[PDB]
Design a protein around this ligand. Structure first.
Ligand SMILES: *[C@@H]1O[C@H](CO)[C@@H](O[C@@H]2O[C@H](CO)[C@@H](O[C@@H]3O[C@H](CO)[C@@H](O)[C@H](O[C@H]4O[C@H](CO)[C@@H](O)[C@H](O)[C@@H]4O)[C@@H]3O)[C@H](O)[C@H]2NC(C)=O)[C@H](O)[C@H]1NC(C)=O
Ligand SMILES: *[C@@H]1O[C@H](CO)[C@@H](O[C@@H]2O[C@H](CO)[C@@H](O)[C@H](O)[C@H]2NC(C)=O)[C@H](O)[C@H]1NC(C)=O
Ligand SMILES: *[C@@H]1O[C@H](CO)[C@@H](O[C@@H]2O[C@H](CO)[C@@H](O)[C@H](O)[C@H]2NC(C)=O)[C@H](O)[C@H]1NC(C)=O
Ligand SMILES: *[C@@H]1O[C@H](CO)[C@@H](O[C@@H]2O[C@H](CO)[C@@H](O)[C@H](O)[C@H]2NC(C)=O)[C@H](O)[C@H]1NC(C)=O
Ligand SMILES: *[C@@H]1O[C@H](CO)[C@@H](O[C@@H]2O[C@H](CO)[C@@H](O)[C@H](O)[C@H]2NC(C)=O)[C@H](O)[C@H]1NC(C)=O
Ligand SMILES: CN1[C@@H](CC(=O)c2ccccc2)CCC[C@H]1C[C@H](O)c1ccccc1
Ligand SMILES: CN1[C@@H](CC(=O)c2ccccc2)CCC[C@H]1C[C@H](O)c1ccccc1
Ligand SMILES: CN1[C@@H](CC(=O)c2ccccc2)CCC[C@H]1C[C@H](O)c1ccccc1
Ligand SMILES: CN1[C@@H](CC(=O)c2ccccc2)CCC[C@H]1C[C@H](O)c1ccccc1
Ligand SMILES: CN1[C@@H](CC(=O)c2ccccc2)CCC[C@H]1C[C@H](O)c1ccccc1
Lengths: 205, 205, 205, 205, 204
């Protein structure tokens, strides 16, 4: 429709995707979830794990809301992420650039709530020593904002999800636990929240 | 291509390729089919298939129609996909980005019917255990829109053909099946359709 | 440079690189040749041949012509292919993207004749069964417009060249034949021409 | 506050990111530091070392400061590095392109002080012969500006950090030492500074 | 600096990087040299890998300024996007060049440009004699892909083997350089190429 086209036009007007959408007194709450899909490979020589996982990120961008009466049918839109602000979450212990497997698009409803849900393949540093033992190996996948502290970006975990782990992998996914931490570095005065997903796994047999 | 040069300007005038071209608010019906060309490799350790395949996607974009009496010779135009809306179809169980082998061009006729026919190479998660057996290994290649539900994008399948499959391959096709489904996700209130290409194959011998 | 600079401004003005420069009842004739330089590898398990070759494409684009008197001294210009229309030739049986090795520039003279001469590495589907037999293996490299039928794009062979084939190669180049075909598809009224290069080769024993 | 939005647009206004922000014929002082995270691999045949490290770069950009009373709650911004000048530091003995593992953003505070802190994977030419010996192997990681001399870009080093080295690597990090050098080249009229990080390491066992 | 900022603005004004800055209707003279830093690998089966420092320099008359008008500014560092660069091709490369260094050129007030990319690239070569005492000899052939010798005058400077790493498994026996001029039965004018010949053998 032309309404959806006017709306797309207006969402981008006077909008800078480099500007985190805070409102004074308020940090941007970003809800964050990682679903492990497949353990692609263990490098026992170089201490590396290769994983495929589904990230779920959502937050409210209040510069992106619209009155639905002015845009009758339009209740959500699908938008390329280059055109809006997205959390600068970094994989603290990645040793490779992420390979995004899915279309780089976000959903946005009329309250300005954004949902961005990439599927990603990425290699991480990990001690994979015990992978062929009963206890298994344990990898920490650690994520957090690279440039935004707690009072700018409040990173929130959502519940752990192993439901997506492929059942025919040569690795048995023993468990996944998660932890949110606020670290002080002393670059900065402010703490930076990070979310850590702890994956325990072992060779089947 | 004098009339052709005039047409190309009018088509891109006030056109936003981020916007799914609904009307009513009809879903855009998208016709989808996969023709399998070559099974490039099986990874029995990591459970992956490497395949080369030919997609056929077609849909009607109503903003892309013209009066043919106003452009005498012009029945059809060849257009970069970067300038028009294309379905955001994702391979749900891919573990690599799709590698597009063919020119990224679509054919558009005067009533707005678009055809995009890329040949593609891509790796998928798959249990390839029984590839040495006589019942062979079965891989599900699942495709669907990433951000559009049923009432926005009506994904319909067109019939499979295996005649494109290369005959001098080390794998033989034992079975092929396409099938459309409509599932709910924890996600959304609207169902999302998908098309699943199920292929069964084995080592020759 | 004085008139060259002004001429470059004019060639891109009112010019659309997406529009095939046909005229009513006049296809764009595209002269096309392949010169094999080296056979990098043969994959007998996966049925792939890895080749380096030089393509030579030439055609006339009447929108690219100019009056030499108006630009004295300027008889040809070197132009990035991104800025002019180029033939959308695809490698039909390629299983990888082409790796263009040379600068992506085309030479254009004042009557609009374009020459584009890329050196390319690409991998193709092929039955290399006979590579160690020295009746040899035979690969067919197949090329054609992906979106223009023969009354839009008139694909013409020119005599192939093997003088450039590497003499110290692991593989002995037995011979190369070329063939222009015109094939119909159940889809379209108009046939689509292709050029196929048949290369026969064998390991040096 | 929409003061962040106001500030960003002022920062990029009348600003060129290709221009090093010198004042008064005074050089831009760039403070530089390297923290070694992991030695991914040693290639003893081709004499290559593969490493992941964290660079710290900071400097003052006088064009990028703002009076904080004019933009109330804004004390620092997060900014894509393509919108501001950043040091063109190169690894002089790298044998691969640097792979940047983190978001390409820089922090900037109101007095124009910038912090850019990429984590990076890169391979370096290095004599890795002694890696099995007790004295280990020694690799110079040599960095400097590619195009700015001492009087434009005053490269200074802060102290390196081995506290980030992963404890479960197959290589023990014996030590990292750093040294700042400055030399004339016969090529150019002005001298160039460089910072070299000398890494000693051996195989556990 | 504010002088630099407004100088940059002026250099790119009306400037088209696609246009070889021929003046006059003589060539742009392009000075060209190669410094071998490391032989990374040989593929004796497929007959093929090196890391080298290219040096290129030429005058772009469009890029001159008067230093009186820009007091401090004697040279600037610009992205090579923003200016014309030689379309030099590696005639026998079998891979795309991986450019290791920042893509920046130096330009001085006379419009003299220096572009010194460090590059890793694979080349076709008969490496079969590599273990032998006579070694393997490889040719690295470079030249303009679209400009003939009266648009682009390719000239070679002396080669630098001082940068070759001493701890390589290959010993660098010798390097020579030659400028040639070839006519192709197609194109009126000749096209000049500079070819660096590299002889090297396995140590031990
Ligand atoms: C766009 O998507 C977002 C994400 O789904 C969506 O936002 C959510 O909206 C609901 C309802 O407006 C929010 O729920 C509210 O939160 C507060 C405190 O957190 C509660 O107090 C509210 O609660 C209720 O209890 C009342 C009793 O006094 C009842 O009368 C009332 O009915 C409520 O049951 C309320 O639940 C929710 O917090 C947000 N979530 C986020 C992450 O913001 C938004 O509505 C969508 N936009 C549109 C236009 O649909
Ligand atoms: C543009 O292409 C479409 C698809 O090939 C043509 O449409 C079909 O037309 C037949 C009869 O006209 C219908 O029975 C089908 O249901 C149509 N299919 C779809 C998907 O719409 C259409 O005729 C072409 N337009 C022109 C002007 O030739
Ligand atoms: C532009 O280039 C074309 C192609 O090289 C020139 O045309 C050829 O002209 C020769 C004689 O000059 C003929 O023998 C060939 O058969 C032509 N080839 C083709 C493909 O047409 C053309 O003359 C050039 N124009 C100018 C003004 O120099
Ligand atoms: C911007 O950041 C810089 C660097 O963090 C701040 O400066 C340092 O402050 C300490 C404490 O007074 C000094 O000892 C250092 O010498 C400063 N470093 C530099 C490079 O100047 C600076 O204060 C910040 N600006 C504002 C407005 O907060
Ligand atoms: C710009 O650079 C060129 C080359 O680096 C300078 O030119 C040269 O002048 C010296 C002595 O005057 C000669 O030995 C060189 O052979 C010259 N080289 C060339 C290419 O002409 C030139 O002077 C520089 N411009 C300024 C303003 O310093
Ligand atoms: C970037 N840094 C915080 C800011 C900060 O610490 C910092 C900033 C500037 C200078 C010095 C330190 C933000 C959150 C990430 C953290 C980075 C971590 O050290 C790190 C670096 C490299 C690999 C793994 C982890
Ligand atoms: C992408 N997602 C739906 C959209 C959506 O989930 C969603 C939308 C908005 C918010 C939260 C979730 C569209 C239909 C597919 C489904 C994805 C499937 O679970 C999936 C996830 C990861 C790998 C493979 C498959
Ligand atoms: C793309 N196709 C023709 C058009 C067409 O078929 C077509 C048109 C419209 C609708 C459906 C199909 C144009 C000429 C090329 C041909 C390609 C060949 O099929 C093919 C497909 C996959 C691998 C190798 C070859
Ligand atoms: C690039 N070079 C200087 C420029 C310059 O030398 C030069 C300039 C002009 C002409 C000839 C040489 C600038 C500062 C860095 C220095 C680097 C080193 O040379 C080098 C080159 C190649 C590989 C490793 C190291
Ligand atoms: C491309 N060719 C000249 C042009 C030309 O020959 C040519 C032009 C037009 C028509 C026919 C041939 C320009 C200068 C470079 C030269 C290169 C060499 O051919 C070549 C081709 C492929 C791989 C290696 C080398």
């Amino acid at each position: 429709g032309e309404f959806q086209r006017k709306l797309y036009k207006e969402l981008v007007k006077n909008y800078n995707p480099d500007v985190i959408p805070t409102q004074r007194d308020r940090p941007v709450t970003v809800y964050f979830s990682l679903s492990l899909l497949q353990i692609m490979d263990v490098d026992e020589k170089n201490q590396v794990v290769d994983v495929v996982f589904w990230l779920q990120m959502s937050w409210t961008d209040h510069y992106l809301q619209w009155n639905v009466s002015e845009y009758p049918g339009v209740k959500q839109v699908s938008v390329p992420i280059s055109s809006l602000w997205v959390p600068d979450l970094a994989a603290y212990n990645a040793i490779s650039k992420p390979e995004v497997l899915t279309p780089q698009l976000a959903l946005v409803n009329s309250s300005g709530h954004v949902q961005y849900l990439p599927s990603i393949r990425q290699r991480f540093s990990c001690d994979v020593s015990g992978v062929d033992t009963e206890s298994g190996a344990t990898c920490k996948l650690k994520f957090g904002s690279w440039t935004h502290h707690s009072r700018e970006l409040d990173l929130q975990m959502q519940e752990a999800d192993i439901s997506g782990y492929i059942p025919y992998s040569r690795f048995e996914l023993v468990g996944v636990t998660q932890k949110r931490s606020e670290r002080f570095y002393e670059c900065c005065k402010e703490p930076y929240p990070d979310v850590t997903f702890t994956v325990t796994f072992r060779k089947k047999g």
